Ligand binder design. Structure first.
Ligand SMILES: CON(C)C(=O)N1N=C(c2cc(F)ccc2F)S[C@@]1(CCCN)c1ccccc1
Ligand SMILES: CON(C)C(=O)N1N=C(c2cc(F)ccc2F)S[C@@]1(CCCN)c1ccccc1
Ligand SMILES: Nc1ncnc2c1ncn2[C@@H]1O[C@H](COP(=O)(O)OP(=O)(O)O)[C@@H](O)[C@H]1O
Ligand SMILES: Nc1ncnc2c1ncn2[C@@H]1O[C@H](COP(=O)(O)OP(=O)(O)O)[C@@H](O)[C@H]1O
Ligand SMILES: [Mg+2]
Ligand SMILES: [Mg+2]
Lengths: 320, 323
C-alpha cells in the first residue's frame, strides 16, 4: 500500500494557491508579477482547501485510518510543512474563544483530541473490553523527551536502544505509558502535556518549531468471537524550513532512498527515523498531511513542500 | 508608608522540606544546615497550603480598594524560577474543565482582580472604564503582548514624557478596553497566545522577561449637588524575571535601585534600565507598593531561597509617599 499524501491549505489570517478537491489538484501562481498566467499543478491523494473545517479533515482522513487501527494494524499520520501553515492546528487544534464549547464538542478540535474521544465512543458497550494508553515522545537536538511523564522534569532526557526481538524496533528507557480509563479522563491528561510543552519551550530555543512530537495511542482489545492490538502514532514534525536538524534531514534521505530504490536506507542516522522506521517503507499504514499557506510571500516554501509531499507518494508500505 | 513585603512558599510536586512558615508570628524560617537555621520576619507569610483567594483577600483587596480611591499601586512578584511567581499573579486552571474561568479556585491575582473591579463598581454611583495593557521587557526591548494587530516581535520605543518627569511614553502600546466582566477571559486569551509565540521567538522568554500588566480605571462620581468628581486609579501587576538570571540588565538594575533606596543614597539609578524607568514611581515614589517574594520548600533550592529572603527583607526599608 502506497503512502497516502494529503495536502491542506490554511486560510489567510491575493492567494497564489488554488485547490480542486474533486480533481484532487493543487495549483500555484508561480509567475507573480511578469507572468500572471503560469501555474504549477500537482495531484495528490486528497486536497483540502482553506474552508476545510476540522470535521472535514476528521471525517475524511482520520476515521478511515482509525477504523483500521481498531482492526489491529499500525497507522501513522505525519503533518509536514513550513512553520505557520497549520501542522499543530491539524494534529491538535485550538479552543473556540471565550469558553464557548466544551473540549469534546469544540469545532476547532483537531485529530488527537477528536480521536481519543471517539476511541471510547466507538468501543464502549459494543462487547469489547479494551485498554487505551498514550505516550508523548518528542525529539529535539536528537535528544528524547517525555512530555506527559508526571513525576519527571521535562528536561530529563531518555535513552534509546535497539530492541533485540524486533530489528526495526527501538526501546525507549522510561517512556511513560499513561492509561486513559474513560472518555472524561482525556482532557486532564492532555493538560499535563500542555504544561510540559511550555516548560520545554522555556528550556529549548524555538522548541515548538524545531522539535518533533510523536503522540502514540495503543489499544488492546478483547473480543472473543480474539485479542487485537492497534497503535496510532500522531506525528507533528518540525517545520520544513530547517544535530538540531538531523532528524528532519534524515527523514528526507529515507524518503528519497525509498523511492529511488536506493540500496542502504539510513533509518539509523537519526532518532526520528529509528523510532518511526516501520512507518517509512514498513508494515505500517502511513499518511502524510502536507500543510501550506496561500500567500505569495511563501511561494518558495509552498513549492518546496508540494514537491516533497509529491515525491513521497511513491513509497510502498505493507501493512501486515 | 514602608513598602509591604510578603513571602509565599510553594508546595512540592509529584517529583525533606527546609522551610517552616509561621503566619501568626509572620516569620519564615529556613534550615541552613541539618541544627542550623536562618529566620526572617515579614509583613505577611503564606505557607504551601495558602489558597489563591487568601492571597487575593489578604494582599490585593486593600490594594484594589486603594486603587479605586484613585491612587497608583504596584504588586511585584519576586523569586527564582519555579517557585510560583506566575502561579501567584495569573494562576492556573483546575484540571478537567471543572470550573468556568470566573469561578476556578486556581485563578490568581490578575484574573480575580479584573473580575471584582466590575463587582465592586456595580451600582455604587461611580461611572468607570477599565483599560488594560500587557507591556513586557525582554533583553531591554519592549513588547506589547495584547495588541491584536502587529506581531509580538515588533518592538516598541520609549521616551521621557515632557509633562511628567518620572514619566515615560511608550509609542504604540495598546490600551484594550474591558467593557464588562465577561469580556475579560477572551482578552487574556489573546495575551496567552502572543506569549506562546514570544516563547518560540525568544530564548527562555518566560523566565528572562519582565511582564507589566496594567489596569487603569477612569472614575466619575457625581454629587448630590450635580458636580462631577474624577478619580483615576492604576494598578501594575508585575511578574518579574527569575532572580537567578544585558539580557539581565533590568533585574540587575532593580537590585541597585532597591539597595540605593534602603541605604538612603541620593542617587537612585532609575534610568539604568527600562524596568526601573517604567516603574520609577513604584520604588521610592508616590505609589503604594507590595512585593510578594516566592520561595521553594526544597533543600535543593537552599542558596536561592536565602538570596531571595535576604533580598525581600532589605526592601522592607523603602519608604513611599502615595499621592
Ligand atoms: C486547554 O488546554 N489544552 C490541553 C488544549 O487546548 N489542548 N490539548 C491538546 C494537546 C496537548 C499536548 F500537550 C499534546 C497533544 C495535544 F493534542 S490539543 C488541544 C489544543 C491545544 C494545542 N495548541 C485541544 C484539546 C481539546 C480540544 C481542543 C484542543
Ligand atoms: C488560555 O486560557 N487563558 C487565557 C488562561 O487560562 N489564563 N489567562 C491568564 C493571563 C494571560 C496573560 F497573557 C496575561 C495575564 C493573565 F492572567 S490567567 C489564566 C491562567 C494563567 C496562565 N495563562 C487564567 C484565566 C482565567 C482563570 C484562571 C486562570
Ligand atoms: N486550517 C486552518 N484554519 C484556521 N486557522 C489556521 C489553519 N491552519 C493554521 N491556522 C492558524 O495559523 C496559525 C499557524 O498555525 P500552527 O498550527 O501554529 O502552524 P504550525 O503548526 O505549522 O506552526 C495558527 O494561529 C492557526 O490558528
Ligand atoms: N502556591 C502554589 N500552589 C500550587 N502550585 C504551585 C504554587 N506555586 C507554584 N506552583 C507550581 O510550581 C510550578 C512553578 O510555577 P510558576 O508560577 O510557573 O513559577 P515561576 O513563574 O515563579 O517560575 C507550577 O507547576 C505551579 O503549578
Ligand atoms: Mg506547530
Ligand atoms: Mg513564569
Amino acid at each position: 500500500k502506497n503512502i497516502q499524501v494529503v495536502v491542506r491549505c490554511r486560510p489567510f489570517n491575493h492567494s497564489i494557491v488554488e485547490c480542486d478537491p474533486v480533481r484532487k489538484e493543487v495549483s500555484v501562481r508561480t509567475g507573480g508579477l511578469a507572468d500572471k498566467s503560469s501555474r504549477k499543478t500537482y495531484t495528490f491523494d486528497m486536497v483540502f482547501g482553506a474552508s476545510t473545517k476540522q470535521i472535514d479533515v476528521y471525517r475524511s482522513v482520520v476515521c478511515p485510518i482509525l477504523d483500521e487501527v481498531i482492526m489491529g494494524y499500525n497507522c501513522t499520520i505525519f503533518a509536514y510543512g513550513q512553520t505557520g501553515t497549520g501542522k499543530t492546528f491539524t494534529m491538535e487544534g485550538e479552543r473556540s474563544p471565550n469558553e464557548e464549547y466544551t473540549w469534546e464538542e469544540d469545532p476547532l478540535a483537531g485529530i488527537i483530541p477528536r480521536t481519543l474521544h471517539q476511541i471510547f465512543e466507538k468501543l464502549t458497550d459494543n462487547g469489547t473490553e479494551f485498554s487505551v494508553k498514550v505516550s508523548l515522545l518528542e525529539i529535539y537536538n536528537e535528544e528524547l523527551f517525555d512530555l506527559l511523564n508526571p513525576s519527571s522534569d521535562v528536561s530529563e532526557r531518555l535513552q534509546m536502544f535497539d530492541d533485540p526481538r524486533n530489528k526495526r524496533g527501538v526501546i525507549i528507557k522510561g517512556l511513560e505509558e499513561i492509561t486513559v480509563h474513560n472518555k472524561d479522563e482525556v482532557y486532564q491528561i492532555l493538560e499535563k502535556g500542555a504544561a510540559k510543552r511550555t516548560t520545554a519551550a522555556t528550556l529549548m530555543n524555538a522548541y515548538s518549531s524545531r522539535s518533533h512530537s510523536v503522540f502514540s495511542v495503543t489499544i488492546h482489545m478483547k473480543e472473543t468471537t480474539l485479542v487485537k492490538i492497534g497503535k496510532l502514532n500522531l506525528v507533528d514534525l518540525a517545520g520544513s524550513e530547517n544535530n538540531i536538524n538531523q532528524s528532519l534531514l534524515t527523514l528526507g534521505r529515507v524518503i528519497t532512498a525509498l523511492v529511488e530504490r536506493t540500496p542502504h536506507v539510513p533509518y539509523r542516522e537519526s532518532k526520528l527515523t529509528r523510532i518511526l522506521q516501520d512507518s517509512l517503507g514498513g508494515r505500517t499504514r502511513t499518511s502524510i498531511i502536507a500543510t501550506i499557506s496561500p500567500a505569495s510571500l511563501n511561494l518558495e516554501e509552498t513549492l518546496s513542500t508540494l514537491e516533497y509531499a509529491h515525491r513521497a507518494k511513491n513509497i510502498l508500505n505493507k501493512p501486515e
